[PDB]
Structure 1
Amino acid sequence: QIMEPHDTLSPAQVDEYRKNGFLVQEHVFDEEEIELLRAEAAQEFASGGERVTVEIVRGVHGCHLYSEVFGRLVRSPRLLPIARQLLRDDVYVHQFKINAKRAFKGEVWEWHQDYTFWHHEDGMPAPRALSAAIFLDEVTEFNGPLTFVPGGHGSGMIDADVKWANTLTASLKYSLDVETMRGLIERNGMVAPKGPRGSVLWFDANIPHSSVPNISPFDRGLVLITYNSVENKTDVTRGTRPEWLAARDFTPLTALQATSF
């Protein structure tokens, strides 16, 4: 039994990722694969307990530690080789979350950089990390797409006002002020990457992003896997969050092979 040989990004794709801070690959996973992930996401929403965020289940953290399916997903030959390529290291999962934005539902998600949280909360020493967002549904203009400042990762951590942090909370602990964002957006603009179901959106730990409610009759499910460089492992002595928000096992991930079961 055979896995398709590892596909990595072209130089042009790598260059685009480093310049813009994000990159979409369309149609990575097929409809049947996505349906398996959707069904498992529903199970995690139902069984997640303290790991679930509710408005009314909004999201769940840490599923790769509790779900065999999601544990295998993070080792997928469609994902792991590219994470290794972009971070130029062995990698592990720092954080796993599923963000469901149901038809005609959702709230405004304030501008933020993930790295600000991971640095201050978890002791991540540098922004040598990224997220892979798997599109469980087509992402459009109207179902609350992740919206970015292209190139906005390239001036490092932007000063935020501090208020366990959680980027799925209503009020973010570290949000970006109007003056800071104005300047960044005036220089760089805004982009909401679109794509079909089964696409993967790769984005930098330090890219500013935000989103709006879903005004479509269609759901917008995202599965977000945050890969971190093993060299860039967090300082567990500075971190206090549970394992399902910030991983403590820095064992390098290996790729899934094709077996008889």
Structure 2
Amino acid sequence: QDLYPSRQRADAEMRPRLDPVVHSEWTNDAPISARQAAAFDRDGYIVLEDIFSADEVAFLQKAAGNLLADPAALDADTIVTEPQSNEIRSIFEIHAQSPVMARLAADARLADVARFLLGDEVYIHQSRLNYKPGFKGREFYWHSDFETWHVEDGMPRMRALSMSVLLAENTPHNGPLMVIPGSHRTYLTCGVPDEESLAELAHRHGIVAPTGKPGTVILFDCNLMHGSNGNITPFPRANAFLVYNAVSNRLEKPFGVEKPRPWFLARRGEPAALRVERGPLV
């Protein structure tokens, strides 16, 4: 029942992936092009530009701006500072609190791609606004999102993806998301990946740090190795994260101990199919 055991041996292994990456047959009636599906297959991520209008983008940026400026109105449980601070690092369940964000996640232009790639109905496993403050923004060391979702939340299979919607401009200077392309086809066991292994992957695959204007979307497979550096620039980097999970891939018990995990980190346990909203955002 555990296809992806981790944190059990005193060594790390590079286990082979035992799941599809794209879980659908591609055809003309798909939300992305055949080349785009093959890219995701091969690289474990793709980038979508100009899929929202500037009115849509502008509306979005204020939704995030407003949530991040009145943090006494939202669940105190769902706020992450840089602990020794009170500058915000993330805000969880933003699909659950902000209506604007809820409407975003349910939009066809995101969810249909999510359903095509996962070949199933989808639901939000998790959401976050990773506001990366200028001057004092701290990094996110390398990790496979799936390796925590699996051991800690009990996500059984590789059938999920993240969508990062950029709300500030991501230049190469304010700590954008870096990925190791192709790393999604290796399951690297551990709770933090080991330097020697990481070194092997990045050598084998190099590193990409996709940039883009606000409204650009980065979609990466749940098992892609990724991270980011800190941000000392005056430019904040606020990026909404949406984790789509296939409903077939509902959470069983955590394939580890410390079971279970806080409610906003991971949605348990019986999901309803997302209702896909076709339209703009006003």
* TM-score range normalised by the length of the shorter chain: 0.7 to 0.9
Question: What is the distance in 1 between the residues matched to 2:216 and 2:77?
Answer: 29
In the other structure, the counterpart of 2:275 is: 254
Question: What is the distance in 2 between the residues matched to 1:190 and 1:250?
Answer: 35
Question: What is the distance in 2 between the residues matched to 1:257 and 1:9?
Answer: 16
In the other structure, the counterpart of 1:142 is: 173
Q: CA deviation at 1:119?
A: 0.2
TM-score, normalising length: structure 2 = 0.80
200, 215, 230: which one aligns with 1:198 = 215
Question: What is the distance in 2 between the residues matched to 1:82 and 1:94?
Answer: 16
For 2:223, the aligned partner's letter is: N
Contact 2:107 2:279 in 1 (8 A): no
For residues 21 and 257 of structure 1, do their structure 2 counterparts lie closer, same or farther at Cα, with a shift above 3 Å needed?
closer
In the other structure, the counterpart of 1:37 is: 60
Question: What is the distance in 2 between the residues matched to 1:182 and 1:58?
Answer: 27
The residue correspondences of 1:1-261 to structure 2 (distance < 5 A) are 8-45=31-68, 46=71, 47-48=73-74, 49-55=76-82, 56-156=87-187, 158-160=188-190, 174-235=191-252, 240-248=260-268, 249-258=270-279
Question: What is the distance in 1 between the residues matched to 2:263 and 2:59?
Answer: 25
For 2:34, the aligned partner's letter is: P
Secondary structure in 2 matching 1:245: coil
TM-score, normalising length: structure 1 = 0.86
Question: What is the distance in 1 between the residues matched to 2:49 and 2:234?
Answer: 22
Contact 1:27 1:197 in 2 (8 A): no
Q: CA deviation at 1:233?
A: 1.0
Q: Which runs of 4+ in 1 moved over 4 A?
A: 236-239
Q: Which runs of 5+ in 2 are unaligned?
A: 1-28
Deviations 1:94-152 (A, max 9, x none): 01011011222311221100001100111100111000100102212111110011000
Question: What is the distance in 2 between the residues matched to 1:13 and 1:235?
Answer: 32
In the other structure, the counterpart of 1:165 is: none
Contact 2:139 2:231 in 1 (8 A): no
Q: CA deviation at 1:40?
A: 2.2
